[PDB]
Amino acid sequence: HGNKGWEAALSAIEMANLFKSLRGTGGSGSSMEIYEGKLTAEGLRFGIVASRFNHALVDRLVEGAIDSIVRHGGREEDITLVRVPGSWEIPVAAGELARKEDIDAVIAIGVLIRGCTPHFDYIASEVSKGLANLSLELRKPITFGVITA
Amino acid sequence: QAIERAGTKHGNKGWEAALSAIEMANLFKSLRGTGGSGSSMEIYEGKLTAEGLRFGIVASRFNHALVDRLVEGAIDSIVRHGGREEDITLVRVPGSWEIPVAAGELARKEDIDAVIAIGVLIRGCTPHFDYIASEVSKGLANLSLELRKPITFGVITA
Amino acid sequence: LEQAIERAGTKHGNKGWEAALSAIEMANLFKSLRGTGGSGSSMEIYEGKLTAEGLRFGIVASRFNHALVDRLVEGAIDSIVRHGGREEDITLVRVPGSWEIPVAAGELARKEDIDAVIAIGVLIRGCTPHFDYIASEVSKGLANLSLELRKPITFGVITA
Amino acid sequence: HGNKGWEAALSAIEMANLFKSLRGTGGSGSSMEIYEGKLTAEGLRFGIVASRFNHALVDRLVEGAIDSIVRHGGREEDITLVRVPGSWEIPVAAGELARKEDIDAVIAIGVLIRGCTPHFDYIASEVSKGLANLSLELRKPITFGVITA
Amino acid sequence: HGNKGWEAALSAIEMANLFKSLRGTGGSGSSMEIYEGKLTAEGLRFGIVASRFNHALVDRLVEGAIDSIVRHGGREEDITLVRVPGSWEIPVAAGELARKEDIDAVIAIGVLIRGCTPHFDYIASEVSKGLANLSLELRKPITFGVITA
Amino acid sequence: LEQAIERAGTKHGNKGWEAALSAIEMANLFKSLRGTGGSGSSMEIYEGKLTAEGLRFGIVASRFNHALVDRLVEGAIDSIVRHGGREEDITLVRVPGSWEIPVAAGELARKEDIDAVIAIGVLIRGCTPHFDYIASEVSKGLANLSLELRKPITFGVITA
Amino acid sequence: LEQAIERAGTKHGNKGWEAALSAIEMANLFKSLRGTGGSGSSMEIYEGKLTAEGLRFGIVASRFNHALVDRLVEGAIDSIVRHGGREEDITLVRVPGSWEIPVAAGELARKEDIDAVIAIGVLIRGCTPHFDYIASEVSKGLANLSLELRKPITFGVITA
Amino acid sequence: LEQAIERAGTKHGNKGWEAALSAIEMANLFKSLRGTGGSGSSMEIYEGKLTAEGLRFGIVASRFNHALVDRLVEGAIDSIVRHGGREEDITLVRVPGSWEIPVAAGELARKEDIDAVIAIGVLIRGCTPHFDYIASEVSKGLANLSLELRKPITFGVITA
């Protein structure tokens, strides 16, 4: 309820529903159209990509993600979980899941080293950059559940 | 020469980088395969058996002492996990700036399953933003996503 | 849902994982040592590969505090399988407590099939500046058995 | 139920059954073999070696040992009880019982003096050492029911 | 705890362990050998054959069978459930499961029509006969969880 | 005192006693049948002695209503011992219920060591003018096994 | 474990099962009626097959007492799948209560894709010798829609 | 099972044990004193052996609080037997209470067969700073009898 894994799952559910409504034909008129997503996960397929580094924390994050999906009406049969050695290769694995036509949304979970950098970090900047570019190119929601130690 | 061989190289960044490449290569080979029947949550993870896989390594020549221990660390990781020394292609480049372009050429071959990039970076004795280091990370990340083939990052700071 | 909660955990670093790797490395090392020698002309180096195909293993685990011990055993099995081993070639033996580990391990090590043994357990107290008799005997027994039978035995206990 | 004599008896029963199963031929295959011992004492012969020193406590320990064996289906006819002056000579007496072909397990019961030693005790270290070596050499379970005052 | 499905599962577990011990080599001697099976299901594979006729009752019976196996240390992953139209064809389906080398025991569950027969019933007599003959020929335990309405 | 109360009872007539004698007689009878023939010149008569020295037996007993079954088993053991048998040469197998007797008996009868098998158990109800399926199958199974393996099997069940 | 407890149940006889079969039969019957006629020379008989391959279905279900309704819906889906249908060709619509079934069903029946509609729900009370207005309207609405659009609509409600 | 529970106890230190040893030592001491003297030339030392073969003993025990007294008597018998005595040569006398011990002991000590007497009993109260008349008389009586008859009498009472 209070971990970033829970929050990341909710965002994925809402975005998946929102996309489903947008492709529908527009209304007749006579008012301002408003589009929004509901929080029911029934009938949706999800994928999760998680890193093993600093495993003490991620298991709690992956825990929340699976719990949230089921609690909101999702069927545990529809979750695909992929594990990778470190955070450097989350984007490449996420891309393989996102290209499957049977996946509606993807959730990325990981942990990054301390953020007391002098000015910049060269590994953290690539994970966020890659996921963002991937979402726009494939036109499919990808959620960022990464946290900083 | 025997003094050089006696040193241990388990655990250096060459070792970890190669180990990640082996896992990712097996993981992708599983994903492309047929999906499971169902009836449960379906988990994927890469095995650590390296037999039958082809690897490529790109290493710079700057600081010839540090690099060699890293390259030898990568090779022994592949061999000790079942790989054959006949299935490794090694490419050497003048400096860290031209690692991405060489890594691109290797990655486009159909006979390569993963690529490992090794090098060292010069650390100025005051913390400014390095315009060379950022370009290596940016270039390697783009290549992997575009070519859909895992590339591992094995550089260190002096 | 609890089945996925427990199955979603990872077991990559616990002492069961490292104990398994040492057994894999030592088992392969012995095959090379008692094989044919080298051609000479240079210093000869021996080291064990991490390929676990065709090797037979045995695991002895105590039952005290089974919540933690169960996770160590799962870690050991995962290490063997992920390195190419077959779950068909693992024998598991459970014993009441730590005092019984050396005698059970002695039975398994005398079989011709097995190539290495892994001992897993949790010791009592331990965090006191005093000599503990149960802890000393278990360490002594495993060490003596390995030297007598000339077969590697790995020591994967912890304190709590 | 709560004394070390009760616990020592249970361990002896379980180890005796476990050894009986191990000597059996291995299975066909197709799964991971798992070996364990059951808690039925029927048809098993036991021996007990107890010391007389500080007799106020040991009688309760020997009490538990005999009670546990009978409660779990053991026949009182199959218990052999041997008494010795002190703890120093438990190992030598235990060795004589363990070499009999009609004994399946041996239980050793005794009490040791206060454990507030400076660094080491020279009598306690020999009882545990001797019993452990004896078990491995003879390949027969020997249980340690000794306690510290 | 009180339904025939629960009882049938326990019998299958005990018989599977008993067979495992018998194939082991005999003891040295010096006493009467006694063989028995323990009630731990860990590492055992089971198969269940159930009929659909009068489904109101069998679901409770199949319920007990699966519950008993799990409660006694069995892994739900190792249960194979097969459903058949009626009781007449339980034996033929049970035979297909029993011939698999990955199955340790088979449980048959079904319901038979009222037992106020004049002298004999021609369908009930064949189910019991077939299962009994099948067990002896294949040398594998098959349990009878059938009940009479 | 209860140990002597139970030990002071006698077990000379219960169905366990007669079942054991039949096994002893049949086991000795078969040795003579498949031995050398007689000299002829007169009608040849075969009959089994009641000496139980050097014979191996196996007993299969169900666990339902163990109060009565335990006394039948003790009767069978007493008969063998009192006729010269050794308790070392008896194998005892326990099964959950009556339905499992024939399959267990089949396992024991296939061993080369054993010379006869004794089946003991208590059936359910029985005192009704109706055909019982469990009772019929147990009788059928034991009869078929004996004829197939050519080894005597004795039938010592009762009704209650 | 509850997932297998619910998954181990069977759904072969509930009203959802029969409602699905009627839709399958009627949908196939209409294809033959509006096809080419027979050769004559004998009485012509029309009847619908039970092959559900290539047919599109729609299901409207109320939400009152979802414990029972959920089981009726699962029964309907099982019937279609077990007769050769594809779960890809099923549309499911949920409505707050029984009063809203006819209007929702009207929307689905006007699509050119669908071949039959199945209505599922649970009515209130019902077990009283009185005329109920909600029950009468729901039955009336479905009957009128079927005749107007010339498309079969099946009626799978129950009382409780 | 209670027979082994009581039989498994030990009786090595209770006052019955020490009382028996004193009687054994004194009985042997008297035989040496009234025997032939030494050769002189050095200081002569007399002391009694602990060999109890060929000696006859008598035991007088009160019946109050028989739970404790019974254990003291068993301790005395064990001491005599374990030092080489025969249970055939022990006479046991039971009396109602402590007041009757001296008179009964006087009867046994006058027999020519017996060599020493052991008195066992439990006194009442005792844990009060007051002079008790029963306690004083019992001690006085035993002391006087020993000096008059010149035969050792041991005093093995306790307070509770």
Author numbering:
A (entry chain L), D (entry chain B), E (entry chain PA): 14 to 162
B (entry chain K): 5 to 162
C (entry chain C), F (entry chain QA), G (entry chain BA), H (entry chain JC): 3 to 162
Paper text:
While the wild-type protein, AaLS-wt, self-assembles into a ∼ 16 nm dodecahedral structure composed of 60 identical monomers,35 the negatively supercharged variants AaLS-neg and AaLS-13 adopt expanded 360- and 720-mer assemblies, respectively, constructed entirely from pentameric capsomers. Moreover, a circularly permuted variant of AaLS, cpAaLS(119), forms not only ∼24 nm and ∼28 nm expanded spherical cages, but also straight ∼24 nm-wide tubes of variable length. The native terminal amino acids were connected via an octapeptide linker using genetic fusion and new sequence termini were introduced either between residues 84 and 85 or 119 and 120, yielding cpAaLS(84) or cpAaLS(119), respectively.
The unique triple helix is not the only tubular structure formed by cpAaLS(119). In the cryo-EM micrographs, short and bent caterpillar-like objects, referred to as “twisted tubes” were also observed albeit at a very low frequency (left). Since the twisted tubular assemblies were heterogeneous, we divided particle images into 3 classes and determined the structures individually. All three distinct twisted tube structures are composed of two compacted helical threads with 0-, 18-, and 28-Å gaps between them. This spring-like arrangement rationalizes the bending tendency. A possible disulfide bridge between two of the introduced cysteine residues at position 85 seems to support the unusual interaction mode, enhancing formation of the twisted tube.
